[PDB]
Write an enzyme that holds these catalytic residues in place. Structure first.
Site, PDB file in Angstrom:
ATOM      1  N   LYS A   1      58.661  39.659  37.550  1.00 20.04           N
ATOM      2  CA  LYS A   1      57.249  39.492  37.904  1.00 20.04           C
ATOM      3  C   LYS A   1      56.589  40.842  37.932  1.00 20.04           C
ATOM      4  CE  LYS A   1      53.403  37.731  39.862  1.00 20.04           C
ATOM      5  NZ  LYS A   1      53.499  37.112  41.174  1.00 20.04           N
TER       6      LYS A   1
ATOM      7  N   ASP B   1      51.897  28.527  43.638  1.00 20.54           N
ATOM      8  CA  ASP B   1      51.646  29.797  44.337  1.00 20.54           C
ATOM      9  C   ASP B   1      51.996  29.622  45.813  1.00 20.54           C
ATOM     10  OD1 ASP B   1      50.995  32.484  44.726  1.00 20.54           O
ATOM     11  OD2 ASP B   1      49.054  32.331  43.734  1.00 20.54           O
TER      12      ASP B   1
ATOM     13  N   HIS C   1      53.209  42.545  39.220  1.00 19.82           N
ATOM     14  CA  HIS C   1      52.178  42.240  40.200  1.00 19.82           C
ATOM     15  C   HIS C   1      51.383  43.489  40.508  1.00 19.82           C
ATOM     16  CE1 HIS C   1      50.168  40.659  43.770  1.00 19.82           C
ATOM     17  NE2 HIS C   1      50.669  39.467  43.494  1.00 19.82           N
TER      18      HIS C   1
ATOM     19  N   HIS D   1      43.400  39.152  52.267  1.00 14.86           N
ATOM     20  CA  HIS D   1      43.251  40.529  51.793  1.00 14.86           C
ATOM     21  C   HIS D   1      42.753  41.470  52.896  1.00 14.86           C
ATOM     22  CE1 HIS D   1      43.770  41.739  47.524  1.00 14.86           C
ATOM     23  NE2 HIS D   1      43.202  42.868  47.911  1.00 14.86           N
TER      24      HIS D   1
ATOM     25  N   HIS E   1      55.920  29.275  40.136  1.00 13.84           N
ATOM     26  CA  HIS E   1      55.223  30.287  40.926  1.00 13.84           C
ATOM     27  C   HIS E   1      55.462  30.065  42.421  1.00 13.84           C
ATOM     28  CE1 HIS E   1      51.453  33.059  41.120  1.00 13.84           C
ATOM     29  NE2 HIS E   1      52.200  33.218  42.196  1.00 13.84           N
TER      30      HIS E   1
ATOM     31  N   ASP F   1      50.036  44.469  43.121  1.00 16.92           N
ATOM     32  CA  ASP F   1      50.430  45.053  44.404  1.00 16.92           C
ATOM     33  C   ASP F   1      51.558  46.090  44.279  1.00 16.92           C
ATOM     34  OD1 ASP F   1      48.556  43.176  45.405  1.00 16.92           O
ATOM     35  OD2 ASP F   1      49.804  42.727  47.154  1.00 16.92           O
TER      36      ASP F   1
ATOM     37  N   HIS G   1      56.699  31.603  46.179  1.00 17.38           N
ATOM     38  CA  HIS G   1      57.088  32.689  47.074  1.00 17.38           C
ATOM     39  C   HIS G   1      58.072  32.145  48.101  1.00 17.38           C
ATOM     40  CE1 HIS G   1      53.676  35.508  45.994  1.00 17.38           C
ATOM     41  NE2 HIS G   1      53.327  34.378  45.406  1.00 17.38           N
TER      42      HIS G   1
ATOM     43  N   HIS H   1      48.227  32.182  37.441  1.00 15.67           N
ATOM     44  CA  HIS H   1      46.854  31.872  37.885  1.00 15.67           C
ATOM     45  C   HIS H   1      45.802  32.511  36.979  1.00 15.67           C
ATOM     46  CE1 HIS H   1      47.454  35.807  39.586  1.00 15.67           C
ATOM     47  NE2 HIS H   1      48.264  35.351  40.525  1.00 15.67           N
TER      48      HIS H   1
ATOM     49  N   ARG I   1      35.617  38.411  42.389  1.00 12.72           N
ATOM     50  CA  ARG I   1      36.880  37.673  42.291  1.00 12.72           C
ATOM     51  C   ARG I   1      36.754  36.144  42.415  1.00 12.72           C
ATOM     52  NH1 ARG I   1      42.923  39.264  44.561  1.00 12.72           N
ATOM     53  NH2 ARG I   1      43.733  37.115  44.656  1.00 12.72           N
TER      54      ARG I   1
ATOM     55  N   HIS J   1      50.674  39.055  37.124  1.00 11.69           N
ATOM     56  CA  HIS J   1      49.464  39.013  37.930  1.00 11.69           C
ATOM     57  C   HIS J   1      48.877  40.402  37.682  1.00 11.69           C
ATOM     58  CE1 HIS J   1      47.476  38.739  42.177  1.00 11.69           C
ATOM     59  NE2 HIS J   1      47.038  39.829  41.572  1.00 11.69           N
TER      60      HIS J   1
ATOM     61  N   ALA K   1      53.131  38.601  49.477  1.00 11.11           N
ATOM     62  CA  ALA K   1      52.153  38.958  48.453  1.00 11.11           C
ATOM     63  C   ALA K   1      52.617  38.658  47.019  1.00 11.11           C
ATOM     64  CB  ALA K   1      51.780  40.428  48.589  1.00 11.11           C
TER      65      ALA K   1
HETATM   66 AU   LIG Z   1      44.700  38.396  49.099  1.00  8.92          AU
HETATM   67 AU   LIG Z   2      44.744  35.240  48.251  1.00  5.00          AU
HETATM   68 NI    NI Z   3      49.359  36.431  42.053  1.00  3.58          NI
HETATM   69 NI    NI Z   4      51.743  34.416  43.854  1.00  7.37          NI
HETATM   70  O   LIG Z   5      49.790  34.883  42.983  1.00  9.35           O
END
Ligand SMILES: [Au+]
Ligand SMILES: [Au+]
Ligand code: NI
Ligand code: NI
Ligand SMILES: [O-]
Ligand SMILES: [Au+]
Ligand SMILES: [Au+]
Ligand SMILES: [Au+]
Ligand SMILES: [Au+]
Ligand code: NI
Ligand code: NI
Ligand SMILES: [O-]
Lengths: 122, 100, 570, 570, 100, 100
Positions: free
Chosen positions: D220, D363, D222, D323, D137, D224, D139, D275, D339, D249, D170
């Protein structure tokens, strides 16, 4: 003349969003026990199954809220929302796979919605 | 010592803070990077002392006041973020509008 | 439903009529137009617009009008305008400026700006976006100078040098076929665009011409190598044949001729006049008179920009070090006083504001600062507003006209002069995607993100070991665009047409993008964007007083500048 | 003659029955067996055993059973066991685990583990040796993150990104054929194994599939980018055809469906749930229920590991920054409280200890720490021993069972999930020689030496100008494995079968070792080593209480952790 | 903080000066790099204080005397040059034969 | 200054020592890297003072005691090694079990 580096001086007035598109108000209820939040640009008929509303009224439409914001439904919450019309080619693909083509095919959208158990197909 | 990459980098922040504190002591109004260095080092040293994230979120807002810094500096700093090793591991601290 | 202007600007960046302050200066730019459709703004994140079936199209493959990269809600500052738009990038080039999204459900989407599965997103809402700076006066002396340049938004370096050799420390020259070849291979590891200048000196054509064939992208005439009538003439002959630019640092000592002799040797041909004011070099005391001629492309170097209280003291002593001058040699004192002139340095401020000097440049590491071309351009603009007031042409209380005049000096105009404006120098469709994002509070001071060929090359970013990228220390760092083989794809080596036709890149194993130098010979002062003024510039031989059309140009030094002590640790 | 146990362990490292403390934790590992012959131990140095005619064979050429590298007297900690052995390496692969030396004069030499003229020696007596960590995981945001990862014993990075672009900040996504190609070329300069994930979003197959063909090693999904039923379905269809893994995710906002809708779209196909606890993202509040299904491969990210007194305060405010949440918007407050849940974070501790969550991950730079996957795995194990006691299955007062369960979470299990376990993920014969040496006092905190493809890539070492390598300052540094062309030979770019078959490496000029992603689609929870538990996980919609088979899972936060302030300068 | 490359480098000079000043305080005669570090940091801190180039050209010659440094050091240092941010931007300061 | 690579690196040790000494002064028990930094810098500064290798081998064992450091730290440090320029050139100093 206090200097704030990179500050804005915004001009006067307001910005009207989605100008000249038809607007529609409907009641929507979260019949589920978990929160649902809905973005500004999802085809409204295709939202979560456990939201109850007149599904026909969501076809070809989305929330009339600023781009990038969302409407929140707490568990058990009923509220009114305002919708606006989808623009461009007025076609929707994917999401919940209820449309996959023109939004004009309301009969077919509703038939798929009913079979899959989206609440409020009247 | 067994310094990792982060440890190497964060020594610089401490150094910048020392520089900035000397400049304050001789009566200079602090600029943007000096102000940021001071608050950041404060947070990291607070974590070393065993303070909590919540304590540092409060204290971080009273390290420098607007009469300590140049015109515009308070408005330039929206928040300051730092990660340090607390007694219970690495944690992120964010101080929002540190200079009021 | 309506959004008030303050909240709109906070969420999407400013729109038509809104104004933004440039860093801590007194300069305000105003959004002239906006390509968006209100209510269909593009944005990315949790529960946002650019999602599959919504603002992101889920049907089309990359080849069907889909972007590689979308910059959302950019406030563009360019010679072509100050306006709000999405910027679309594909294959490392700008392909669309307008409105990005999904034509399925959105109004007003530019047809080739579809956000699809292949699309990366950069959020530019609340940012100012400019073209990368083009620095045409670089001495290649210390490889560390590249990060310095990137950190202040420079994306192209034109000049010469082989490192800290005396010839390179004095002149922007990479001499001869072998040195040029070596530096071309060196360039393979530099994360910035490069063009190399050869030695514009010799009395036969062939020794000069073989440098162009070897890979040079232009020539430099420098007094240190003998800026004689012969060298001037042969270099311009080579340049006319090869379609490359010539830069000149003329004979300060007036040894073989005065200014008028240099102009006679130039004989109406196109030439780039370096540090035209003269503190950086040139016919004492009247070199700046070059800036009035139609065939001259005039640039300043940065240490005289702008005129401040410490300027003269700094320059007098800089010259003594730089030139090894001695206080007890009266000829040296005379030389320094004939060269460092408050009268011409002051006038240079004004000539810039009137658009008589067209370009800025650094003179990096010889008599100028690698990371301060953009910085000192805006300081000059700011000083001129404070002293001369808003320009006649300004409307709405904004400084848009001045901002276009000044941004042109380090972007489009150097690109045009060098013959590379078909690739770089401005935010326009069909050009290479060299882009700089600035937070308005840091504008012209410290670049937020530097994009080279559609990939981020440099960024101000925080702790690499942190949970998010923003924790301290936030510093300038090289990004993935500079790593491995990607450095080849995101950067351009500019070369002459003949070296390209002769296959020099293959010969040397160059893997970088190869750019073609062209269209340098049929341009003039009139082709410099927003800075095309020709006029009679007179410099008094006794008093050094500068007159432009019978009127005396005078200016005062200032005690303080913006974009200085508020920002820098040292 | 007899040697007492204390002196034996001091000279050769521990043997059968001896126990070692892991760093400053309360965890003890015990040597289960030893491959040596007492009296014929391999060792190197002045007047030692590995000398010509003695422990080093002087007859055989490299091809005749001779090693390139021998690691002597290693204490191996792996899912396959905790034991003592010599490790033999040849052509960058582990070829022998057993007893190295010279069959001329020594008993018990593993036939293919001859020390000859071609053999380099690394002394591992008194060290713990593990497989390199596999972080699935990541980025790709800041290239500086690679040294951070290496310094804590991570040798493989799987994820996505193009640098500090918003999409990459993200989501672990490198979108489309062009971006994937660019990052593949970037990878040529990164001293670590890499696999790249494409965007798992779209309503037609082709836009997704073209990423696999371009070189992506997985996908992936996601929220988003729109974690809709359609995107979920198409991605899993592509994945089944291409034999790559999909990571998810899920839709935190429950916009298009609840958890049960996501599972219906998955329809019993194999998926890696990122996660899984949910602080990092996913169906509010019951995402963690994924960890009970046979077709789900569940991982945690590291910032919730383990549950401590500062955890909640840190996460609430981290989320507000991450966020862009506002304190005066009640919907934002509701979102954050739905959350960030102390109930599920606490239960996550216990689920790990029971083997219900199979994997750890970072992450890195989005909501997690690049150099803390290994570190926080052991802190969790240590906390669970203090609170729950020794596991039922433990014998001899040691923590061997727990140590195998936990080491599996960052080595073998991520390798299996990703389809790369034939190359990496464990110390076994025939696998790539990615090895980490640890001093037991620094175990899980700071790696001593990191071996990539049989050559040291990273080391904690001292003054380069000193007479010996140990004088201060001792810091993590890149070694010869990372220099010149050797970086190509010691590292693997993992790619899909179709991109390999289509010749993408040649097309792009990739010089790194190319690894094949395979066998991802016919695995399940039952294939996760020491972590294969399936069960009904219930999360109360009102109280967020977690139940596993009718029993309530509750845990306390702790004030202090080992492997923290004793070790770190900041 | 937004440190650029030069800012990173110049922190080192400050650090070296601190080291050298400590060494002076315990009575050691300073060597070549220590002397250079002290005068350089003096110049940069003077610019931060808002002094002029001309002031620093004068003052720089009285920061250290020959009884502060080792034999030969005065003759080794021909000049010391430093660039710093004055209130009116970056300027070069040169101090000639700083140790007389 | 003419800093070579080693000189650059060793400035970091001095900085870490300053950081650690500040932490000691406010009453914190020192950890592993802090303890190592303190003793190392002590050795290098001793060499600058003109002490002998033999003197520093003795003194290095009395810079920090076990009541100065966290539990386990004395046992973590087997020896500390440093090279510095003595009046007679660069020499290696090793202090064995510095914290007793
Ligand atoms: Au966030
Ligand atoms: Au976050
Ligand atoms: Ni995620
Ligand atoms: Ni991530
Ligand atoms: O994530
Ligand atoms: Au000069
Ligand atoms: Au000069
Ligand atoms: Au003026
Ligand atoms: Au517990
Ligand atoms: Ni010049
Ligand atoms: Ni020059
Ligand atoms: O120059």
């Amino acid at each position: 003349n206090y200097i704030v580096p990179g500050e804005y001086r915004v001009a006067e007035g307001e910005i009207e969003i989605n100008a000249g598109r038809e607007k529609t108000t409907i009641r929507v209820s979260n019949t589920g026990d978990r929160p649902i939040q809905v973005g500004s640009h999802i085809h409204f008929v295709e939202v979560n199954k456990e939201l109850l509303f007149d599904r026909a009224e969501g076809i070809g439409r989305r929330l009339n809220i600023p781009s990038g914001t969302a409407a929140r439904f707490e568990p058990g919450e009923e509220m009114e929302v305002e919708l606006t019309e989808l623009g461009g080619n007025r076609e929707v693909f994917g999401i919940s796979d209820l449309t996959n083509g023109s939004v004009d095919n309301k009969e077919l959208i509703l038939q798929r919605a009913k079979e899959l158990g989206y609440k409020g197909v009247e | 010592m067994h310094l990792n990459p982060a440890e190497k980098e964060k020594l610089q922040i401490f150094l910048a803070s020392e520089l900035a504190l000397k400049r304050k002591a001789r009566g200079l109004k602090l600029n943007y990077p000096e102000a940021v260095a001071i608050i950041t080092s404060f947070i990291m040293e607070g974590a070393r002392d065993g303070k909590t994230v919540a304590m540092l979120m409060e204290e971080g807002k009273h390290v420098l006041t607007r009469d300590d810094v140049m015109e515009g500096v308070p408005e330039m700093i929206d928040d300051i973020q730092a990660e340090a090793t607390f007694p219970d591991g690495t944690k992120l601290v964010t101080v929002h509008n540190p200079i009021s | 439903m309506k959004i008030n202007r303050q909240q709109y600007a906070e969420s999407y960046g400013p729109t038509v009529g809104d104004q933004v302050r440039l860093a801590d200066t007194d300069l305000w730019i105003e959004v002239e137009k906006d390509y968006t459709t209100y209510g269909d703004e593009a944005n990315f994140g949790g529960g946002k617009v650019l999602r599959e079936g919504m603002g992101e199209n889920g049907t089309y493959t990359r080849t069907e009008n889909v972007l590689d990269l979308l910059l959302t809600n950019a406030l563009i500052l360019d010679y072509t305008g100050i306006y709000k738009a999405d910027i679309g990038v594909k294959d490392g080039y700008i392909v669309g400026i307008g409105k990005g999204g999904n034509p399925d459900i959105m109004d007003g989407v530019t047809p080739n700006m579809i956000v699809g599965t292949a699309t990366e997103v950069i959020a530019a809402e609340g940012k100012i976006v400019t073209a990368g700076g083009i620095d045409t006066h670089v001495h290649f002396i210390n490889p560390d100078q590249v990060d310095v340049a990137l950190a202040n938004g420079i994306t192209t370096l034109f000049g010469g040098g082989t490192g800290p050799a005396e010839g390179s420390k004095a002149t922007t020259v990479t001499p001869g076929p072998w040195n040029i070849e070596k530096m071309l291979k060196s360039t393979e590891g530099l994360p910035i665009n490069v063009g190399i200048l050869g030695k514009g000196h010799g009395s036969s054509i062939a020794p000069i011409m073989e440098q162009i064939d070897a890979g040079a992208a232009g020539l430099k005439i420098h007094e240190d190598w003998g800026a004689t009538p012969a060298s001037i003439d042969r270099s311009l002959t080579v340049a006319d044949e090869a379609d490359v630019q010539v830069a000149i640092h003329s004979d300060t000592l007036n040894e073989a001729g005065f200014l008028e002799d240099t102009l006679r040797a130039i004989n109406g041909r196109v030439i780039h006049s370096f540090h035209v004011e003269g503190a950086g070099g040139g016919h004492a005391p009247d070199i700046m008179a070059m800036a009035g001629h139609p065939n001259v492309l005039p640039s300043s170097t940065n240490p005289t920009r702008p005129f401040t209280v410490n300027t003269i003291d700094e320059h007098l002593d800089m010259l003594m070090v730089c030139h090894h001058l001695k206080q007890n040699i009266p000829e040296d004192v005379a030389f320094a006083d004939s060269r460092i002139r408050p009268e011409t340095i002051a006038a240079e401020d004004i000539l810039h504001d009137l658009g008589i000097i067209s370009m800025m440049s650094t003179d990096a590491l010889a008599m100028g600062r690698a990371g301060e071309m953009v910085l000192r351009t805006w300081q000059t603009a700011d000083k001129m507003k404070k002293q001369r007031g808003p320009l006649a042409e300004e409307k709405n209380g904004s400084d848009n006209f001045r901002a276009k005049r000044y941004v042109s000096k380090y972007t489009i105009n150097p690109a045009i002069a060098q013959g590379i404006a078909h690739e770089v120098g401005s935010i326009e469709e069909g050009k290479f995607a060299d882009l700089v994002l600035w937070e308005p509070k840091f504008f012209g001071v410290k670049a937020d993100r530097v994009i080279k060929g559609g990939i981020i090359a440099y960024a101000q970013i925080g702790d690499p070991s942190a949970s998010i990228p923003t924790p301290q220390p936030v510093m300038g760092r090289r990004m993935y665009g500079t790593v491995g083989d990607l450095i080849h794809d995101t950067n351009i080596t500019f070369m002459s047409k003949s070296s390209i036709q002769q296959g020099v890149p293959a010969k040397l194993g160059l893997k970088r993008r190869i750019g073609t130098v062209k269209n340098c010979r049929n341009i003039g002062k009139k082709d410099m964007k927003w800075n095309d003024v020709t006029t009679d510039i007179d410099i008094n031989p006794e008093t050094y007083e500068v007159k432009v059309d019978g009127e005396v140009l005078t200016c005062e030094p200032v005690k303080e500048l913006p974009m200085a002590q508020r920002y820098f640790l040292f």
